[PDB]
C-alpha cells in the first residue's frame, strides 16, 4: 500500500507509482491465474491492435514533419 | 601492448564454470534487495552462466535460514 520511505508523512504528494503490494505490482504475475506460456506477450499485441486511425495519424504527422520541404 | 581491464568473471574461460557457493552469506547479501528478492545478471556484475549459479546459492542460503528473504521476520 504505502511501501517504506525516508519521507515525512507522504499523503499530500499523490504517489501511487510504486505504492502497491499487489495493485499493479510485480507479485500479481502468479496470484489468481493459470500458467500461460503464450498469453502475457499475446495480450500486448492484442491490446494495441484496435486504435489504428490514431496510431497512423501520429506516423503521418512525423513523416510530413521530418522532410524539410515545407 | 597486451592485456586489457577485465570485468567480473570476464576475459577468461576457466572461471565460474562450476557454481558460485553459498557459505559466504555476507557476499550473498550483496545480491539481494531489502525485500529479500534476487537481483539479475546486469546488477550482480556477471553474465548468464554465473547469474544462474548465483541464484541457486542465494536460494540455498535463505531456505537454510542464513540469508534475508523478506523485510520481515518473526
Amino acid at each position: 500500500p504505502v511501501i517504506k520511505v525516508r519521507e515525512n508523512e507522504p499523503f499530500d504528494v499523490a504517489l501511487r507509482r510504486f505504492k502497491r503490494s499487489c495493485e499493479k505490482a510485480g507479485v500479481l504475475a502468479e496470484v489468481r491465474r493459470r500458467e500461460f506460456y503464450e498469453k502475457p506477450t499475446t495480450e500486448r499485441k492484442r491490446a494495441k491492435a484496435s486504435a489504428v486511425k490514431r496510431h497512423a495519424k501520429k506516423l503521418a504527422r512525423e513523416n510530413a514533419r521530418r522532410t524539410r520541404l515545407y | 601492448a597486451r592485456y586489457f581491464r577485465r570485468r567480473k568473471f570476464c576475459r577468461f574461460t576457466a572461471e565460474g564454470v562450476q557454481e558460485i557457493d553459498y557459505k559466504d552469506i555476507a557476499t550473498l547479501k550483496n545480491y539481494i534487495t531489502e525485500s529479500g528478492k534476487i537481483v539479475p545478471s546486469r546488477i550482480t556484475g556477471t553474465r548468464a552462466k554465473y547469474q544462474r549459479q548465483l541464484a541457486r546459492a542465494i536460494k540455498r542460503a535463505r531456505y537454510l535460514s542464513l540469508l534475508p528473504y523478506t523485510d520481515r521476520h518473526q
Partner: protein, 135 residues
C-alpha cells in the same frame, strides 16, 4: 578422500556448549587422516515454527577434508541426536583459505537474519574466532 562441508544446529541455551560437540566431530575426521581447514559459527537464526516450544535456534558451520564415509556417518549422528536439532551436510565443498571469514556473516545474522531474542555473546562462543584485523 573428498572435501566436505557440514552445517548443524543446537538450541540458543547450547550455543556456548557447541564447541564440546565440535571437539568430537573434529576427532572423528582427524582420526580418519582428514583435516579441519575452517571452523565457523553462523549464530542465532529465527524459525517459522517453535522446536520444543522456542522460536529461535543456533547454527554452526565446519569446513573440512575428510573421507566421505566420516561425513555420511556425521550427517547421521546429527540426525540421531536430540540436542543437535537439525543439520545439513553437503558433498564436494571446501573451506576458505581466509582467517576470520565468518565474522562478516555473524554481522549479517545479528542485523537482518534473526529476530535477536538472545545476546550476541553466547552464540559467539562457537566456531570461528572474530579476529577483526584478519577480516
Amino acid at each position: 578422500m573428498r572435501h566436505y562441508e557440514i552445517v548443524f544446529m543446537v538450541h540458543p541455551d547450547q550455543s556456548e556448549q557447541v564447541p564440546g560437540m565440535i571437539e568430537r566431530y573434529t576427532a572423528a575426521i582427524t582420526g580418519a587422516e582428514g583435516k579441519i581447514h575452517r571452523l565457523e559459527d553462523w549464530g542465532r537464526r529465527q524459525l517459522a515454527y517453535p522446536i520444543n516450544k522456542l522460536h529461535k535456534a543456533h547454527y554452526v558451520l565446519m569446513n573440512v577434508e575428510a573421507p566421505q564415509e566420516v561425513i555420511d556417518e556425521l550427517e547421521t549422528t546429527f540426525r540421531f541426536n536430540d540436542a543437535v536439532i537439525r543439520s545439513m551436510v553437503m558433498r564436494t565443498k571446501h573451506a576458505v583459505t581466509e582467517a576470520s571469514p565468518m565474522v562478516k556473516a555473524k554481522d549479517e545474522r545479528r542485523e537482518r537474519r534473526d529476530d535477536f531474542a538472545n545476546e550476541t555473546a553466547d552464540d559467539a562462543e562457537a566456531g570461528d574466532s572474530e579476529e577483526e584485523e584478519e577480516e
